[PDB]
């Protein structure tokens, strides 16, 4: 309600009043699965290209590279910058294990 958007602040000049509508819904701030999936396929093809060309460059992919593809790819592009990541590549069958964690 507009009545609860009014606030007042007092200084030496006196009391000054100000105003500022719908609250945001959770369903507008999370990308739908379809767009997520197509973006994942795009981003990971792009990463394949960048990784092969950087292997030609003989360097490692940096933060400034892929920065336009940061929060994208269902296996999130951020996961190529984790520290344990090399040990994560030895964690096999984690999803079955997670679906069996409710059981213990």
């Amino acid at each position: 309600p507009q009545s609860d958007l009014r606030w007042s602040k007092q200084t030496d000049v006196g009391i000054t009043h100000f105003r500022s509508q719908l609250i945001p819904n959770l369903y507008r701030y999370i990308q739908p699965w379809e767009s997520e999936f197509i973006d994942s396929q795009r981003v990971w093809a792009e990463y394949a290209l960048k990784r092969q060309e950087a292997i030609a460059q003989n360097r490692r992919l940096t933060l400034e590279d892929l920065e336009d593809s940061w929060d994208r790819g269902i296996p999130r592009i951020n996961t190529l910058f984790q520290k344990d990541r090399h040990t994560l590549a030895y964690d096999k069958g984690w999803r079955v294990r997670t679906d069996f964690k409710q059981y213990q």
Partner: peptide, 27 residues
């Protein structure tokens, strides 16, 4: 103007599931 939530069915014609969905920048 009651404070109870209203069923979103029928009040979402002007929005998409991703409108206002933003991705954070590298830290």
């Amino acid at each position: 103007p009651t404070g109870e939530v209203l069923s979103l069915v029928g009040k979402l014609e002007g929005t998409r599931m991703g409108d206002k969905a933003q991705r954070t920048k590298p830290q």
